[PDB]
């Protein structure tokens, strides 16, 4: 039982309490809508700095919430769908489902290059009744670690990221076993990033309006392709 357990419990709890809520409505601004994917954006300023909380929803046919979160968390397949990371490695293994990752992002010219140091944890939220669906969550939030101190090559960004997945199942035809034609993954994705620098907003917001849709479309499509023909992992 590692030293971040209470911290992990608090982060997961906060996301499960406040991130699943459907759209502060008009406080959130829809910036991209493509099929079932909707990307919302908010422009907040607190403590002398302006930030841009990101929230997106998506419905993905033929995959379970368990499968989506597995592929989002598994560092071994990151290179197969992620396109902004330059390099990364596991700084520390805290448990079978919790690791500390250090990664550098490719420089979005002409802004300074960013690196990030975060704990990545995947956990199941058990269903309390037969009516409540099984929820899986991956939380990525920044932490400090002596092996990945601040450097003068990158700007250290602070993140609080969560992907929350729920599996909707429809009755199959007759008395048949469930197939992938009967499952739908409800994805809620939130990202609160502090860039840590002084890059102009127009560049930071245009880049976010461009990279978040591309990542969700590419990541979910990737999960669909890897699970095709495979037995369902609920």
């Amino acid at each position: 039982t590692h030293r971040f357990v209470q911290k992990v419990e608090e982060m997961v709890q906060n996301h499960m309490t406040y991130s699943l809520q459907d759209v502060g409505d008009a406080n959130w601004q829809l910036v991209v809508e493509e099929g079932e994917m909707k990307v919302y954006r908010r422009e907040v300023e607190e403590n002398g700095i302006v930030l841009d909380p990101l929230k997106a929803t998506h419905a993905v046919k033929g995959v379970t919430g368990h499968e989506v979160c597995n592929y989002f968390w598994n560092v071994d397949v990151r290179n197969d769908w992620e396109t902004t990371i330059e390099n990364f490695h596991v700084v520390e293994t805290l448990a079978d489902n919790a690791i500390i990752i250090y990664q550098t992002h490719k420089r979005v010219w002409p802004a300074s290059q960013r690196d990030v140091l975060y704990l990545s944890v995947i956990r199941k939220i058990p269903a309390l009744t037969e009516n409540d669906p099984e929820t899986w969550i991956v939380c990525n939030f920044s932490v400090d670690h002596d092996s990945a101190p601040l450097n003068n090559r990158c700007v250290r960004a602070k993140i609080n990221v969560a992907m929350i997945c729920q599996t909707l199942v429809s009755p199959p035809e007759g008395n048949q076993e469930i197939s992938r034609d009967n499952i739908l993954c409800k994805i809620t994705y939130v990202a609160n990033v502090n860039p840590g620098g002084w890059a102009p907003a127009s560049v930071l917001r245009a880049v976010a309006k461009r990279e978040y849709p591309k990542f969700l479309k590419r990541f979910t499509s990737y999960v669909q392709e890897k699970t095709a023909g495979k037995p369902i992992l609920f």
């Binding site: 419905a59 269903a127 009744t129 037969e130 009516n131 669906p133 099984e134 599996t167 909707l168 199942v169 429809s170 009755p171 035809e173 007759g174 469930i178 409800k186 609920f234």
Partner: protein, 97 residues
């Protein structure tokens, strides 16, 4: 215009269809384990204001009730029993609106 009775409800990916006690009242549907446990908290309810009631074309016993991404899957014992439930839910919804 309220109604209650046993109906087969799709629950989760383990149990699938299970008999449950359904109650139409207060512009909503509520379901319980059985009639005996009505005075013991509802297991799930759905408001009918913006609900669509779609009968299944191939499963003549099945009718679905959806409010946005939230969906109930219900089976009566035969098409005759299904139509009575469908008509009751539409009449109750309309008289409540």
């Amino acid at each position: 215009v309220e109604r209650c009775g046993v109906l087969s409800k799709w629950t989760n990916y383990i149990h699938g269809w299970q008999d449950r006690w359904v109650v139409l009242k207060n512009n909503a549907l509520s379901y319980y384990k059985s009639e005996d446990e009505t005075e013991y908290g509802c297991r799930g309810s759905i408001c009918l204001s913006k609900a669509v009631i779609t009968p299944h074309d191939f499963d003549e016993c099945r009718f679905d009730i959806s409010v946005n991404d939230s969906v109930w899957y219900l089976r009566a014992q035969d098409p005759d029993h299904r139509q009575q439930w469908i008509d009751a839910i539409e009449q109750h919804k309309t008289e409540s609106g």
